[PDB]
Design a protein around this ligand. Structure first.
Ligand code: PCF
Ligand code: PCF
Ligand code: NAG
Ligand code: NAG
Lengths: 146, 146
């Protein structure tokens, strides 16, 4: 079975949706069932509130197999409202064996007000160079800036 | 300055060309000057002899920076003479900090006789996901099979 995990820790989840419980995105190298019908899932995703400037994701490659991630696109679609989203990790790297936090930042410029559309396109490859996991095609996320 | 190195060790070089001296291919992340005019370099490259079944390449990422390699193509163009070239490393991985040997195998089938054309297309990427080194475009190598 797969060894990859991606989740939002209970504390971060509490700050985001009010419920203090881990939000599983990938478990044992498999996308969580709520993400399969992605367009339906995006409707239950509100625009990231003004109080949140960054979000903590936790990931791990829990076994002996090596996995490589790559951020293909970190792009704001409303550059006048928010600058490009950021990550505190190199764009290309290894998924760590020890569970580690990736901080995704949403840099509202303050020179305007509104909701900024943005992309976080990431892929995970195995040691054969095959893409085994990735941000659903054409996924768009939103950040409320004031 | 760069930290990547790729070379053919003096012992392997002796077996291949008769001269016992390291053959530098990449030094400090830069392609060796003999490879710049690649078509001229390929003329000084004879078809790998019948006595050699595999070749040892030595590589290292000598610094703190992480580098990722990927074998994009390991392909025989004469499948009736030689099967696809092989490597004893995963197709996608990290360039090791400790100098390590990659064994490239040339599996002559023995069901025929002649010279087999083949490709070894490899890329090296930095932590930003940019290709910084790669097999020269359209490079072709040859293996004498009997
Ligand atoms: C560090 C990478 C972050 C890569 C992704 C970075 C995207 C950055 C955008 C952040 C926006 C996320 C929050 C959206 C606003 C919000 O409040 O949404 C809550 C959501 C949906 O969760 P929910 O509303 O709870 O839905 C029900 C699921 N239950 C309840 C059953 C657990 O909570 C979420 O589930 C958020 C999901 C965001 C990710 C969707 C898919 C990404 C898949 C990438 C796969 C490749 C990587 C695999 C790695 C092993
Ligand atoms: C493990 C990867 C092997 C990746 C490449 C695998 C290719 C497999 C094909 C093997 C065929 C190589 C032998 C050809 C037959 C032969 O006898 O050639 C000798 C050659 C040329 O060397 P020379 O004849 O000595 O030329 C003069 C150079 N002086 C003398 C100044 C040092 O000796 C050679 O220099 C061989 C050069 C073969 C490689 C050419 C370019 C590859 C660049 C890849 C860059 C990306 C990777 C960077 C990594 C940090
Ligand atoms: C995000 O992680 C950082 C570093 O561990 C921590 O300082 C911060 O409190 C975390 N945020 C939330 C909302 O849990
Ligand atoms: C290639 O490397 C292997 C493993 O270290 C060794 O057994 C073999 O003798 C080497 N070949 C040459 C020609 O040096």
């Amino acid at each position: 079975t797969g060894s990859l995990y991606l989740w939002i820790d209970a504390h971060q989840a509490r700050v985001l949706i009010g419920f203090e419980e881990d939000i599983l995105i990938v478990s044992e190298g498999k996308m969580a069932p709520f993400t399969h019908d992605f367009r339906k899932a995006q409707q239950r995703m509100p625009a990231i509130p003004v109080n949140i400037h960054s979000m903590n994701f936790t990931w791990q490659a829990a076994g002996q197999a090596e996995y490589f991630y790559e951020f293909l696109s970190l792009r704001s679609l409303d550059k006048g409202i928010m600058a490009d989203p950021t990550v505190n990790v190199p764009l290309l790297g290894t998924v760590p064996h020890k569970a580690s936090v990736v901080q995704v930042g949403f840099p509202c410029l303050g020179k305007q007000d509104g909701v900024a559309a943005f992309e976080v396109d990431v892929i995970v490859m195995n040691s054969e160079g095959n893409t085994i996991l990735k941000t659903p095609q054409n996924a768009i996320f939103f950040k409320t800036c004031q």
